[PDB]
Amino acid sequence: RPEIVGPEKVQSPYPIRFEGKVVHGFGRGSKELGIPTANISEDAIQELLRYRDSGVYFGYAMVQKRVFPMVMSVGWNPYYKNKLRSAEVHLIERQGEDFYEEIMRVIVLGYIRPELNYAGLDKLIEDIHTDIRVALNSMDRPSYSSYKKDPFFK
Ligand SMILES: Nc1ncnc2c1ncn2[C@@H]1O[C@H](COP(=O)(O)OP(=O)(O)O)[C@@H](O)[C@H]1O
The conformation of residue 152, written as its DSSP 8-state character, comes to: G
Give 8: exposed, middle or buried? Use CB within 10 Å, 0-12, 13-18, 19+: exposed
Q: How many CB atoms lie within 10 A of CB 110?
A: 20
Name the amino acid, one letter, at 103.
Answer: I
CA–CA separation, 37 vs 71, rounded Å?
A: 9
CA of 147 to the centre of ligand 1 (A): 24
- Ligand 1 pocket: which of 98, 125, 129 to mutate (most atoms within 8 A of CB): 98
Tell me which method was used to determine the 3D structure. Answer: X-ray
Give residue 146's region: left, alpha or beta (phi > 0; psi -120 to 50).
alpha
Tell me whether residue 88 is one of the annotated catalytic residues.
yes
- H-assigned helices in 9-89: 46-49
CA–CA separation, 47 vs 135, rounded Å?
A: 25
CA of 26 to the centre of ligand 1 (A): 12
CATH 2.40.50.140: does it fit domain 1-154?
no
CA–CA separation, 40 vs 89, rounded Å?
A: 8
Closest residue by Cα to residue 123 from 75, 115, 55 = 115
Q: Domain limits of the chain?
A: 1-154
Closest residue by Cα to residue 105 from 143, 138, 146, 72 = 72
